[PDB]
Design a protein around this nucleic acid. Structure first.
Ligand SMILES: [Mg+2]
Ligand SMILES: [Mg+2]
Ligand SMILES: [Mg+2]
Ligand SMILES: [Mg+2]
Ligand SMILES: [Mg+2]
Ligand SMILES: [Mg+2]
Ligand SMILES: [Mg+2]
Ligand SMILES: [Mg+2]
Ligand SMILES: [Mg+2]
Ligand SMILES: [Mg+2]
Ligand SMILES: [Mg+2]
Ligand SMILES: [Mg+2]
Ligand SMILES: [Mg+2]
Ligand SMILES: [Mg+2]
Ligand SMILES: [Mg+2]
Ligand SMILES: [Mg+2]
Ligand SMILES: [Mg+2]
Ligand SMILES: [Mg+2]
Ligand SMILES: [Mg+2]
Ligand SMILES: [Mg+2]
Ligand SMILES: [Mg+2]
Ligand SMILES: [Mg+2]
Ligand SMILES: [Mg+2]
Ligand SMILES: [Mg+2]
Ligand SMILES: [Mg+2]
Ligand SMILES: [Mg+2]
Ligand SMILES: [Mg+2]
Ligand SMILES: [Mg+2]
Ligand SMILES: [Mg+2]
Ligand SMILES: [Mg+2]
Ligand SMILES: [Mg+2]
Ligand SMILES: [Mg+2]
Ligand SMILES: [Mg+2]
Ligand SMILES: [Mg+2]
Ligand SMILES: [Mg+2]
Ligand SMILES: [Mg+2]
Ligand SMILES: [Mg+2]
Ligand SMILES: [Mg+2]
Ligand SMILES: [Mg+2]
Ligand SMILES: [Mg+2]
Ligand SMILES: [Mg+2]
Ligand SMILES: [Mg+2]
Ligand SMILES: [Mg+2]
Ligand SMILES: [Mg+2]
Ligand SMILES: [Mg+2]
Ligand SMILES: [Mg+2]
Ligand SMILES: [Mg+2]
Ligand SMILES: [Mg+2]
Ligand SMILES: [Mg+2]
Ligand SMILES: [Mg+2]
Ligand SMILES: [Mg+2]
Ligand SMILES: [Mg+2]
Ligand SMILES: [Mg+2]
Ligand SMILES: [Mg+2]
Ligand SMILES: [Mg+2]
Ligand SMILES: [Mg+2]
Ligand SMILES: [Mg+2]
Ligand SMILES: [Mg+2]
Ligand SMILES: [Mg+2]
Ligand SMILES: [Mg+2]
Ligand SMILES: [Mg+2]
Ligand SMILES: [Mg+2]
Ligand SMILES: [Mg+2]
Ligand SMILES: [Mg+2]
Ligand SMILES: [Mg+2]
Ligand SMILES: [Mg+2]
Ligand SMILES: [Mg+2]
Ligand SMILES: [Mg+2]
Ligand SMILES: [Mg+2]
Ligand SMILES: [Mg+2]
Ligand SMILES: [Mg+2]
Ligand SMILES: [Mg+2]
Ligand SMILES: [Mg+2]
Ligand SMILES: [Mg+2]
Ligand SMILES: [Mg+2]
Ligand SMILES: [Mg+2]
Ligand SMILES: [Mg+2]
Ligand SMILES: [Mg+2]
Ligand SMILES: [Mg+2]
Ligand SMILES: [Mg+2]
Ligand SMILES: [Mg+2]
Ligand SMILES: [Mg+2]
Ligand SMILES: [Mg+2]
Ligand SMILES: [Mg+2]
Ligand SMILES: [Mg+2]
Ligand SMILES: [Mg+2]
Ligand SMILES: [Mg+2]
Ligand SMILES: [Mg+2]
Ligand SMILES: [Mg+2]
Ligand SMILES: [Mg+2]
Ligand SMILES: [Mg+2]
Ligand SMILES: [Mg+2]
Ligand SMILES: [Mg+2]
Ligand SMILES: [Mg+2]
Ligand SMILES: [Mg+2]
Ligand SMILES: [Mg+2]
Lengths: 118, 59, 136, 205, 122
RNA sequence: ACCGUGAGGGAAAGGUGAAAAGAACCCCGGGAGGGGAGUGAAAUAGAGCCUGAAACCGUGGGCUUACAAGCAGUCACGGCC
RNA sequence: UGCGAAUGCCGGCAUGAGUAACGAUAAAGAGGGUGAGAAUCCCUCUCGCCGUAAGCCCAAGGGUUCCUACGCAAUGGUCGU
RNA sequence: CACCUCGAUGUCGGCUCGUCGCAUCCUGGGGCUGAAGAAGGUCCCAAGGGUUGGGCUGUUCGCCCAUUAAAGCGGCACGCGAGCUGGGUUCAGAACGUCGUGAGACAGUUCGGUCUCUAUCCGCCACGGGCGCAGGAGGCUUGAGGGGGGCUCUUCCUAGUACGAGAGGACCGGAAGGGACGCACCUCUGGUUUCCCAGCUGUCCCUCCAGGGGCAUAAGCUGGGUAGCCAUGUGCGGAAGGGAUAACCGCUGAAAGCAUCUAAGCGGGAAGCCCGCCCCAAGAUGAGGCCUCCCACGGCGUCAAGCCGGUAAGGACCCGGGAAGACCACCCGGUGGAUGGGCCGGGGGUGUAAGCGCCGCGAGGCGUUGAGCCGACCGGUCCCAAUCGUCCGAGGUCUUGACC
């Protein structure tokens, strides 16, 4: 039945589902706004809200933790020094997800927008 | 398993009644808050989507 | 609402009167038994093998060898049937549940489980402290 | 035939008299009777009840301030206690004393589309030897030319769960008027947070 | 939980060592025997010159189970093996002297000689 | 053509108009296609072109059908067009 | 010289049905580009797979498939710039 | 026998799934007994439910072991291969005995031997869409009619009483435990828990060290493991009761002065029947009822029903979701808002992070530190998103009888 179960598999096994969320994080933090399909988006929020929040912590530990998923040192600086501060007085909700009215043509997919909040 | 096969060609009556649910629904649309055009709701418009956040710029 | 706070209200059966312990360190629990309409307090003492934490109705299991047969007893940690529980020694577990001892049970477990000085030292020192600090 | 609405809260164990006594605490809040039925206007006898006071007004236009004790109109009104004609308005858990036996209706967790074998505890196919893709399957459904069809009750897989279920003769272990709690042992149907109605038993009545 | 085919340690001095359940005597159809249940067993391993010989069909009572016994007081016990005591049809031990702990459930099922003869009753 | 290693096997496929006069130019369109314009006696002769049947698919209209059950018709009465 | 039957022959068009399937479970994501149109083309980044190979060289066999410009009706199991 | 089927009605046995019959194996009720009691025998009523696990053989069957209340017998294409098996039979290989000069052959034996993804209709399990239910709506519910269910044992008290020389040992009445089956549930017990924590190996990598990522499966391996789904785990079910009956036991009672349970009557009398329990249920077109809402516009049809446009109560749509779910449905939210996500608190799990200090030549050890990390569980909080909107929806047919 799979009742009161949290989190989507999206038609891919675990390690690929990881790599997905990581590769969406690196991309989102990089461009500040991104277009994915709606469900991949709704599921990216939590993944980076946590990635950001740990940058708001600032400690070396908290960095190294973010470095596990995002993996690139330069991005982490941009996360820690540039991005993180803008949210310092924001408790939660560092990402917006907005649905686009255009259906991707040729697979039919509903699209959305994912941007860092401000 | 053997090979189930249809026993009788189905009447034009019958397939056409099968299809009695097949008809489409028109897309549900609402007038754009700013722009003139129609947009399906809860979606950033193809022209100048929203206010507080930063819409995809057609502006 | 207060779904859990209601079920958490539900206990006037929690009890604070019993000691701290973790897996790996050995204890002795005294337990009311019937034994034919009479009543006895039977003691059971061995290593605590695991602890299931649910809050009220957490439970913990104790293992010992008895007359050449290992035994495990599982006690509800809040049971009204537990008179007292003494820690007879402390030990350094290294992980949450140690079932792995079942297939050792020999000298190899007193090597694997060597006593935990940090919690021993803070027992004596806590017992010297509370002893000295009650009277005067 | 006393009855009262409630919601399954959760389960625990109670330690009564050196015994465990697993219990399901259901909260049956005050229950503001909004209608009565009479062999005059209705042709039988019951009380409407009403429960869970919320909404400010989602209640919209059809409503009762006719019995007006619907002041703070309740989300779920689920109603008939059948032949029950209580003292005044507002039945409470005062209704039940401990050691009373009770039947409990509730809504069984939905399993959705469930195989035979879990619907019906069928045996299934062997997992080896011949095998060939029938492990979880029903088997024969019929005979041959006669009757040449399938019986009208025939156990098969379909939606299973999410239905009315009344487990009977439950013991009331405790009742806590303070917070409007009530404690029964065991079986009571459905999810925590779901609606249950709670009646006196049919062992005697 | 013991069932036919299950091997059992022999917890007394009769001279059987291992017995294997062949029936559990409870109902018409009972599925498993537990602590305090009588079973019928075939004697598989036995010590020379015993009261009992390899191959004998006999009655035993189950004094220990690898699967935990649950008590009303909310607790449980479980032992490291499954063991039985060989008994006669009047249902009393065929031996003098049982070995190792026995479950206290026996007293409640009416086996007072064995709980008595038992070195420890848990 | 195609099929067969090979010997060998072995098809489908004709018709605008008297005359190309084979539709300049404009419009929608990426093109395809079509709408006007024009040619023609005729363009549902427009090149997927003489005639253009039937099965088949579709749009519009009339009568009819959601408590009836059957080789689907037939005989009778009644309604609506 | 008259067809309704020959599991007849040739052709056409139905039914099953918007059903099964779209051909290895190595795996994808995003940004930018181009264009009438982009999941499917180009370029960057990130992720995954092969590595006694799923890389490279030779012989058969194939016979222009090679390189480049313009191009998308059809071929491509979707799309296609 | 040779009647349908040779332009194909797959053949034994098993397994799965049953359903029916009663000539009843058990349980319930009975009569007779060469029935002391207990225990049998035989025959009558009774089909509600039950009717075990193994050894041997392809076996059905049978024999046997251990039990049991019992280990029923039949039918349904010797029920069931578009459900499975494929041991047997029943192609082609090979051998034995035997028969035959031979090729070969044998209800003789032996070893081996391709069981076909896609369900049109009926039927069956589920679930929706439509219309109807003559005014439309939101609630609530009656139950015609269906379905489910229906088993049984031991012990104890009565009472070592009745009965019996004894040995043995009731009825009736009451009590407590079981077995197997059913429905539900997850507190406990016990599982899973694909990334919730930890540890470990080889390699490649980021960034040399420290730290960490990939891959080693679609978890590399290993030790654990919340919620959820679960049984081995827990709760509850069989009834009670009411009625009518079976065989049977009787009353009263003739025909027939007697007699007779029967011909007129009546009373007892079964696990069975009808109710009672649980579930579905007004497509119950015989479309039921109660509570509450909105209202009896504007025009053409000057009329039998209507019609068009907004409307009204109300709905939809769209969106955030859900122990609801294949889609649909159902339920909860939709800023006058705690619906999901984030954050925070708690629970919970892992089991004392990294960094730094100290001890050791070192692997390492200690402290900081129950640290750090931390899905789902119980809450909190408008930080992100449920914005803004759109559409549909009665104005009530007539006859007839009773009211101001
Ligand atoms: Mg879910
Ligand atoms: Mg897919
Ligand atoms: Mg992997
Ligand atoms: Mg197959
Ligand atoms: Mg099939
Ligand atoms: Mg709370
Ligand atoms: Mg469900
Ligand atoms: Mg089931
Ligand atoms: Mg199985
Ligand atoms: Mg298989
Ligand atoms: Mg068949
Ligand atoms: Mg028939
Ligand atoms: Mg006894
Ligand atoms: Mg050729
Ligand atoms: Mg002209
Ligand atoms: Mg023209
Ligand atoms: Mg013409
Ligand atoms: Mg012409
Ligand atoms: Mg001509
Ligand atoms: Mg023509
Ligand atoms: Mg038409
Ligand atoms: Mg009818
Ligand atoms: Mg009609
Ligand atoms: Mg029909
Ligand atoms: Mg078709
Ligand atoms: Mg189909
Ligand atoms: Mg399908
Ligand atoms: Mg498919
Ligand atoms: Mg492919
Ligand atoms: Mg593929
Ligand atoms: Mg290599
Ligand atoms: Mg060449
Ligand atoms: Mg070629
Ligand atoms: Mg070429
Ligand atoms: Mg090329
Ligand atoms: Mg090119
Ligand atoms: Mg092309
Ligand atoms: Mg294509
Ligand atoms: Mg014949
Ligand atoms: Mg003849
Ligand atoms: Mg034939
Ligand atoms: Mg045929
Ligand atoms: Mg056939
Ligand atoms: Mg009979
Ligand atoms: Mg009898
Ligand atoms: Mg007798
Ligand atoms: Mg008799
Ligand atoms: Mg029967
Ligand atoms: Mg064997
Ligand atoms: Mg065999
Ligand atoms: Mg035989
Ligand atoms: Mg048998
Ligand atoms: Mg049968
Ligand atoms: Mg026959
Ligand atoms: Mg057959
Ligand atoms: Mg087959
Ligand atoms: Mg068939
Ligand atoms: Mg064979
Ligand atoms: Mg042949
Ligand atoms: Mg010869
Ligand atoms: Mg032969
Ligand atoms: Mg033969
Ligand atoms: Mg072989
Ligand atoms: Mg075979
Ligand atoms: Mg049919
Ligand atoms: Mg419907
Ligand atoms: Mg009824
Ligand atoms: Mg019934
Ligand atoms: Mg007595
Ligand atoms: Mg739990
Ligand atoms: Mg559990
Ligand atoms: Mg769990
Ligand atoms: Mg580098
Ligand atoms: Mg290193
Ligand atoms: Mg790699
Ligand atoms: Mg590594
Ligand atoms: Mg690799
Ligand atoms: Mg791999
Ligand atoms: Mg585990
Ligand atoms: Mg009578
Ligand atoms: Mg008389
Ligand atoms: Mg007389
Ligand atoms: Mg009579
Ligand atoms: Mg009677
Ligand atoms: Mg009964
Ligand atoms: Mg109902
Ligand atoms: Mg109705
Ligand atoms: Mg109605
Ligand atoms: Mg959903
Ligand atoms: Mg709503
Ligand atoms: Mg929230
Ligand atoms: Mg903890
Ligand atoms: Mg440390
Ligand atoms: Mg040093
Ligand atoms: Mg926490
Ligand atoms: Mg608030």
């Amino acid at each position: 039945m799979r009742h009161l179960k949290s989190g989507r598999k999206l038609n891919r096994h675990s390690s690929h589902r990881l790599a997905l969320y990581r590769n969406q994080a690196k991309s989102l933090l990089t461009h500040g706004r991104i277009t994915t399909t709606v469900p991949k988006a709704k599921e990216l929020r939590g993944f980076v809200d946590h990635l950001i929040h740990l940058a708001k912590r600032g400690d070396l530990h908290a960095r190294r933790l973010v470095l596990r998923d995002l993996q690139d040192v330069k991005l982490v600086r941009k996360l820690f020094d540039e991005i993180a501060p803008r949210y310092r007085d924001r408790q939660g909700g560092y990402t917006r997800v907005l649905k686009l009215a255009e259906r991707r043509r040729g697979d039919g997919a509903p699209l959305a927008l994912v941007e860092l909040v401000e | 398993a053997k090979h189930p096969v249809p026993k009788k060609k189905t009447s034009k009556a019958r397939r056409d009644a099968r299809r009695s649910h097949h008809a489409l629904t028109p897309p549900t649309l609402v007038p754009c808050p700013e722009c003139k055009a129609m947009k399906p709701p809860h979606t950033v418009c193809p022209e100048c989507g929203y206010y507080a956040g930063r819409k995809v710029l057609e502006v | 609402n207060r779904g859990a706070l209601i079920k958490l209200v539900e206990s006037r059966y929690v009890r604070t009167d019993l000691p701290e312990f973790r897996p790996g360190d050995t204890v002795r629990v005294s337990y009311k038994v019937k034994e034919g309409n009479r009543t006895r307090i039977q003691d059971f003492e061995g290593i605590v093998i695991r602890i299931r934490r649910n809050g009220f109705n957490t439970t913990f299991t104790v293992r010992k060898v008895s007359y050449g047969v290992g035994v495990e007893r599982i006690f509800p940690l809040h049971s009204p049937l537990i008179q007292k529980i003494d820690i007879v020694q402390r030990g350094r577990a290294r992980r949450a549940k140690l079932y792995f001892i079942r297939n050792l049970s020999d000298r190899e477990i007193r090597r694997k489980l060597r006593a935990d000085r940090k919690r021993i030292d803070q027992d004596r020192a806590a017992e010297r402290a509370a002893k000295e600090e009650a009277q005067k | 035939m006393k009855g009262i609405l409630g919601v399954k809260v959760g389960m625990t164990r109670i330690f009564r008299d050196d015994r465990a006594v697993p219990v399901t605490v259901i909260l049956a809040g005050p229950c503001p009777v909004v209608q009565r039925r009479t062999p005059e206007k209705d042709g039988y006898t019951a009380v409407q009840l009403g429960f869970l006071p919320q909404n400010p007004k989602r209640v919209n236009r059809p409503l009762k301030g006719h019995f007006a004790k619907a002041g703070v109109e309740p989300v779920r009104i689920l109603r008939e206690i059948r032949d029950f004609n209580p003292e005044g308005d507002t039945v409470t858990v005062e209704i039940f004393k401990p050691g009373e036996r009770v039947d409990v209706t509730g809504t069984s967790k939905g399993r959705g589309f469930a195989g035979v074998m879990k619907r019906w505890n069928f045996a299934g196919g062997p997992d080896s030897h011949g095998a060939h893709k029938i492990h979880r399957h029903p088997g024969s459904i019929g005979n041959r030319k006669t009757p040449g069809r399938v019986y009208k009750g025939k156990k098969m897989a379909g939606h299973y769960g999410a239905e009315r279920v009344t487990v009977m003769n439950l013991e009331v272990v405790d009742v806590i008027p303070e917070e409007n709690l009530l404690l029964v042992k065991g079986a009571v149907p459905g999810p925590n947070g779901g609606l249950v109605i709670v009646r006196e038993t049919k062992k005697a009545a | 939980m013991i069932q036919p085919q299950t091997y059992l340690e022999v917890a007394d001095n009769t001279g059987a060592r291992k017995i294997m359940c062949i029936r559990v005597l409870k109902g018409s159809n009972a599925k498993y025997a537990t602590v305090g249940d009588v079973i019928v067993a075939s004697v598989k391993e036995a010590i020379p010159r015993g009261a009992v010989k390899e191959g004998d069909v006999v009655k035993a009572v189950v004094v220990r189970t690898k699967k935990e016994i649950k008590r009303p007081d909310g607790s449980a016990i479980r032992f490291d093996d499954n063991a039985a005591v060989i008994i006669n049809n009047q249902l009393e031990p065929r031996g003098t002297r049982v070995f190792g702990p026995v479950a206290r459930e026996l007293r409640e099922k009416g086996f007072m000689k064995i709980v008595s003869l038992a070195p420890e009753v848990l």
